Design a binder for this molecule. Structure first.
Ligand code: SF4
Ligand code: NI
Ligand code: NI
Length: 729
C-alpha cells in the first residue's frame, strides 16, 4: 500500500527518457546477472547444489535478498530460482521503472557473487585482509547503524570509482569525514586515499569494502538496518524501500570513468531512493533531474550531494588549539587529576543564556573579563560565570532554557573540559593537560559561539559570549541569573494539563521502537525524563518539520481516563496502525507505550492491590518476581501492556500521576533509594492529597521485602490506603 514509486514522478517529462542511460543500465544488469548465473553454475558443479553458502557473522542470510523478497538463502540451490526471477524483471522497454528494476537485479547479482566469493572464506584463511572489510558483520551494523537511522550520523556517502587525482579524493573525503558522514568506499579510490595517508577503517566509519561487486556490502549493511531497527518483515519490498528513503540518508558519488556495471549498481541505489552524483559531464539523454546528475566541479561536489539528499550539516571547521570532538564527553578529571575546578565547593559559579535586541550588540564578540587560566598553580580553584547573548530574526524568550542545557554538552565537546549540572550549580572544571597544551578561556568562549552558530542556523543570527571570573562580579551576575531562572520557573509553574489546549508528540525513539509514540503534556514528562512539554514545544517551533508535533485536544472520549480522538488518531497513524486508543491517566487500560529508555517501570500487583515502581538503576528483585531489565524487555518496544507502564521519575510527583488509578495513594512498593530521591515531592503531593506527610513511610521497599508475601504484613501494619481502595484488576 506504500506506493513508493510516487517519489520518482515528475523526475522525467513524458517522452523525454534519458535513453542512453537506460541502455547502459540494461546492458549492465544483464551482464551482472549473467556473471552471477554462470558463477553459481560453476559453484554447484564444484560443491553440489546442497552446499552451504553465506556471509560471516550475520543472522540475515543474504540481507539484500532477505529484505526485498524475503528468501533465506542458505545453500547454492536457493540461489537458482532467484536469479531466474531477476532475469525476468530486466525488461528491454526503456522506461525509468524498468531501469529501477534492473538496478535491483544488479544488487541481487552482486550479493550472490559476493556470497559465492565467501564460499572460500574461513577464519583461518580469510578472503578479507587489511585494509579492506568485505562483508561487514552484524555487530558493527547494530552499533553504528542505530546512529545512522537516528541521524546522529548526518548521512552516508557511497563512493565508487576514482577521483580525478589523489589529492582531490583526499579533499572531498576529508571534507565528508569531517562533517561526520559514514563512508562506503569501493574500488581504486581506496588506494588513492591510502597513498595520501588518510586513516580509514571501521573505527573511522570509513569502510574500504573492496572493488567491483564488493560495493554491494554497502547495500546489505543499509538493508540490515531496516531488518534490525525498523523491524520490517523479510520480503516487504516497498516497506524496506520507504524505510531506506526515509531513514538512511545515503547517496552515491560515482567518480571516474563510467562502466555499465557500476551504472547498474548506481541505478539500484536509485531504486531504493538514493540519488547518484557523478563528476563526469553528462548529455541530457544520460541524466535524471534529481537522481542521476553531473557535478564536475569538485569544489562544489560534496555540497550538491547533501543538497540533493536533504542532508543538513551542522558542523563547521574552526581554528582551535585543542582538537574538538564528541568522543571526549565521557572524560573525567578524577581527583588525582583535577586542575582548576569551579563550583560545588560553595565556590561561586553560574551560567546563563539570554535574548537581546539587534543593534545593541555585534556578531562574534568574545570577551574574557578578569583573570584567565594563567593565574593558578595546578590544583587551584576560581569562581566562574558565563553569559551567552543571542539575537535572531525569529528568536524567542521561550528558546532560552533550551539553549542553556546545550552549553553542558558544548563544554565537554573538547579535551580537558568537564561540566556537569547547570545554572548556579555549574560544576565547571578544567584539566591539567589542556592548560599544558595552551588552551585558555577565550578559545572556550569561541567554542560555545561556534557550536551555537552551528546547531541553530534557522534561529540564531548574531550571537556573542562574555565570561567573568571575579569572585565579586560573578555573584553580582549570579543574582540576575537567579532572577531569570525565577521568571522561567514561574512560567513553568503556571502549566497544567487543563491550562493548555495542545500536547506534543515525540517520535524520536522510533529509530529503535518504530511503533512507539510519546505524548508529552505539561503534567506528564516524556518517559526518558529529558523532554518536557515546554521542551517539545520549543523543539517544534524551532523545527516545525521535526519529530515533535502539536496535537490539539479534540474529540473527547473519556473525561476520567484521559482519552481524546485526536491523540488516538495521531498515535494510530504513527504506530503503523498497531495502536488505536490511549488513556493518559491510567496504566490498566490502553496505556501509552514505551520505547526502552524509560527512567522507571510501574506494574500493578493485585496481590498487594497496588503499584510497584522500579527505577532503571535498581538491580534488585521486585515483588513481581523480575528485575528491571527483565521487565524492560516486556514493557518496551512500542507495545501496549495494560497493567504496566514506563515513566520518567518526575511523573511520580505529578498531580496527574495515574490519577484515574488512584494516583500516589496506589503506590505500595519502590526501591529505598528512589523513595529518598523523590522524598520531598512525594511528601508534598501526599500532603495535598490528604494522605498525610507521613505517607512515604507506608510505602514498602526492598528492606521490607522483595516478595508480596513479605510486603503485605507491612502494608497492613502501616494502614496503607491502597488496601482500602478499589481493586484495579
Ligand atoms: S522517551 Fe519519548 S519523549 Fe523521550 S526521546 Fe523517546 S520518544 Fe521522545
Ligand atoms: Ni525508551
Ligand atoms: Ni526513548
Amino acid at each position: 500500500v506504500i506506493n513508493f514509486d510516487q517519489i520518482f514522478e515528475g523526475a522525467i517529462e513524458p517522452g523525454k527518457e534519458p535513453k542512453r542511460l537506460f541502455k547502459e543500465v540494461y546492458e549492465g544488469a544483464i551482464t551482472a546477472t549473467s556473471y552471477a548465473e554462470i558463477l553459481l553454475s560453476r559453484a554447484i558443479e564444484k560443491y553440489g547444489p546442497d552446499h552451504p553458502v553465506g556471509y560471516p557473522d550475520t543472522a540475515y542470510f543474504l540481507p539484500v535478498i532477505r529484505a526485498f523478497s524475503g528468501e533465506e538463502v542458505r545453500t547454492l540451490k536457493d540461489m537458482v530460482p532467484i536469479l531466474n526471477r531477476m532475469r525476468a524483471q530486466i525488461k528491454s522497454e526503456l522506461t525509468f521503472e524498468n531501469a529501477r528494476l534492473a538496478g535491483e537485479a544488479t544488487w541481487y547479482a552482486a550479493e550472490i557473487i559476493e556470497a559465492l566469493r565467501y564460499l572460500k572464506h574461513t577464519p583461518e584463511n580469510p578472503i578479507v585482509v587489511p585494509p579492506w572489510t568485505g562483508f561487514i558483520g552484524d555487530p558493527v551494523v547494530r552499533q553504528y547503524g542505530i546512529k545512522m537511522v537516528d541521524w546522529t550520523i548526518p548521512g552516508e556517502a557511497i563512493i565508487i570509482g576514482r577521483a580525478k587525482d589523489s589529492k582531490a579524493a583526499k579533499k572531498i573525503v576529508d571534507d565528508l569525514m569531517g562533517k561526520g558522514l559514514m563512508l562506503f568506499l569501493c574500488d581504486e579510490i581506496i588506494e588513492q586515499l591510502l597513498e595520501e595517508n588518510v586513516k580509514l577503517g571501521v573505527d573511522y566509519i570509513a569502510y574500504p569494502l573492496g572493488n567491483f561487486t564488493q560495493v554491494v556490502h554497502a547495500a546489505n549493511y543499509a538493508l540490515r538496518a531496516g531488518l534490525m531497527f525498523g523491524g520490517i518483515a523479510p520480503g516487504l519490498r516497498d516497506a524496506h524501500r520507504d524505510y531506506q528513503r526515509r531513514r538512511v540518508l545515503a547517496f552515491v558519488l560515482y567518480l571516474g570513468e563510467h562502466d555499465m556495471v557500476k551504472t547498474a549498481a548506481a541505478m539500484g541505489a536509485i531504486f531504493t531512493g538514493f540519488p547518484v552524483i557523478t563528476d563526469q559531464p553528462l548529455p541530457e539523454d544520460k541524466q535524471i533531474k534529481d537522481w542521476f546528475i553531473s557535478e564536475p566541479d569538485y569544489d562544489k561536489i560534496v555540497q550538491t550531494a547533501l543538497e540533493v539528499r536533504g542532508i543538513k550539516i551542522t558542523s563547521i571547521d574552526i581554528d582551535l588549539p585543542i582538537n574538538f570532538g564528541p568522543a571526549f564527553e565521557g572524560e573525567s578529571i578524577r581527583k588525582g587529576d583535577m586542575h582548576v575546578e569551579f563550583g560545588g565547593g560553595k565556590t561561586p559559579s553560574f551560567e546563563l543564556v539570554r535574548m537581546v535586541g539587534p543593534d545593541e550588540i555585534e556578531d562574534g564578540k568574545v570577551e574574557v573579563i578578569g583573570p584567565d587560566i594563567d593565574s593558578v598553580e595546578p590544583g587551584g580553584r576560581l569562581p566562574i560565570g558565563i553569559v551567552v547573548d543571542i539575537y535572531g530574526r525569529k528568536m524567542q524568550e521561550d528558546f532560552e532554557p533550551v539553549l542553556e542545557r546545550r552549553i553542558h554538552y558544548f563544554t565537554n565537546y573538547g579535551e580537558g573540559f568537564w561540566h556537569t549540572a547547570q545554572r548556579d550549580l555549574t560544576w565547571v572544571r578544567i584539566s591539567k593537560e589542556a592548560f599544558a597544551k595552551g588552551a585558555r578561556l577565550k578559545h572556550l568562549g569561541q567554542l560555545l559561539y561556534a557550536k551555537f552558530k552551528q546547531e541553530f542556523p534557522s534561529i540564531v543570527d548574531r550571537v556573542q559570549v562574555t565570561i567573568y571570573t571575579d569572585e565579586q562580579k560573578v555573584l553580582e551576575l549570579r543574582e540576575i541569573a537567579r532572577k531569570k531562572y525565577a521568571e522561567r520557573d514561574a512560567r513553568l509553574r503556571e502549566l497544567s494539563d487543563e491550562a493548555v489546549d495542545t500536547y506534543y508528540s515525540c517520535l524520536l525513539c522510533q529509530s529503535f521502537a518504530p511503533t512507539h509514540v510519546c505524548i508529552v503534556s505539561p503534567e506528564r514528562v516524556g518517559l526518558c525524563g529529558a523532554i518536557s512539554w515546554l521542551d517539545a514545544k520549543a523543539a517544534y517551533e524551532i523545527n516545525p518539520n521535526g519529530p515533535n508535533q502539536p496535537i490539539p485536544k479534540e474529540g473527547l472520549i473519556d473525561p476520567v481516563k484521559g482519552q481524546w480522538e485526536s491523540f488516538n488518531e495521531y498515535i494510530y497513524k504513527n504506530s503503523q496502525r498497531t495502536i488505536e486508543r490511549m488513556n493518559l491517566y491510567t496504566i490498566m487500560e490502553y496505556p501509552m507505550t514505551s520505547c526502552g529508555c524509560f527512567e522507571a517501570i510501574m506494574a500493578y500487583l493485585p496481590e498487594l492491590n497496588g503499584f510497584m515502581i522500579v527505577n532503571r538503576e535498581h538491580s534488585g528483585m521486585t515483588p513481581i518476581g523480575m528485575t528491571f531489565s527483565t521487565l524492560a524487555g516486556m514493557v518496551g518496544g512500542g507495545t501496549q501492556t495494560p497493567g504496566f507502564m514506563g515513566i520518567g521519575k518526575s511523573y511520580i510527583g505529578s498531580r496527574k500521576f495515574v490519577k484515574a488509578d488512584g494516583g500516589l495513594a496506589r503506590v505500595v512498593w519502590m526501591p529505598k533509594d528512589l523513595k529518598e530521591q523523590l522524598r520531598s515531592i512525594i511528601e508534598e503531593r501526599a500532603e495535598e492529597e490528604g494522605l498525610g506527610r507521613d505517607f512515604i513511610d507506608k510505602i514498602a521497599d526492598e528492606t521490607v521485602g522483595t516478595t508480596v508475601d513479605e510486603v503485605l504484613p507491612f502494608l497492613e501494619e502501616k494502614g496503607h490506603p491502597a488496601l482500602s481502595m478499589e481493586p484495579l484488576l
